[PDB]
Amino acid sequence: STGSATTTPIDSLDDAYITPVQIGTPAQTLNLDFDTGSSDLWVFSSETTASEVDGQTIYTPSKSTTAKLLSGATWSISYGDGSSSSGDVYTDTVSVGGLTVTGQAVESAKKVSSSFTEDSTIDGLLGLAFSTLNTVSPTQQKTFFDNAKASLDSPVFTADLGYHAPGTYNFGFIDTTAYTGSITYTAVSTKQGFWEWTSTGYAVGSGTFKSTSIDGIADTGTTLLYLPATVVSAYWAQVSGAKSSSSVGGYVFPCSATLPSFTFGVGSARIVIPGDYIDFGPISTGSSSCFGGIQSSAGIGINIFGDVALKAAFVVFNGATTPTLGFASK
């Protein structure tokens, strides 16, 4: 089997991407944030505290003839941005882009934090990291990809995120029309439950490439590119007036600037992030200070190749017995 679904930016900045997901019988379609940095499929639901729902589409398990309470199971998750959610668990039929999994754990939110209430565009998360991170207790549950894997034509999914435009998540096949040149594959460590890999280095604009190992995670559920402070300082030094602002919480730059590109290494290959991809717009409405798309990972404890990086590539998440990542230009 295969599946193919379009992913759409939630706003004009690409702060996140939503992908429609069918849950239950008859189908209830929710728009979920596909997140290669976590391993829970959770949804706004009929169980979510009413004051914490503001415009999201909810899953109602009582209206699904295939929904079953997973007796005794609870879940509770915290993300890197300090957001959180928790609740109980159903199994149900879940389809993405024509690919169907029966008996998928669908984590129903009883509580969500303020950032999830305040974002009407995201109806929940679909985790695509390794199932060792899944938070369901007392019986840990598998991701949608882990449940689908054996049925797929090839044990892979791909992320093809757009810049200010829709893109695609494919399951079970590699669309050879979706990228240029060749796909370079690189080793993955699953020891932290992430798609963790080591970039071979970077360049800033037309500058020389610096060969240096940068260990980090491929994380579709993080907006920005988080790298070591040395690398980030080197990038923003090329932008007149850019500075790290303690009050804003990262690098800002004059909105009048033209940003340089940023290149990262994948083995001997290179992925170029155009400068425009690094502009996250005014820090507040009408400001001439703009928020940078490359930020320091200092204090986070890991480097994160988030959407700013991934949207410059066609990315293969190879779930073979020994997982690997692939990157192509596009």
Ligand SMILES: CN[C@H]1CC[C@H](C(F)(F)F)CC1
């Ligand atoms: C912006 N609201 C949420 C969206 C999901 C994010 C992640 F994917 F990481 F789970 C966290 C913040």
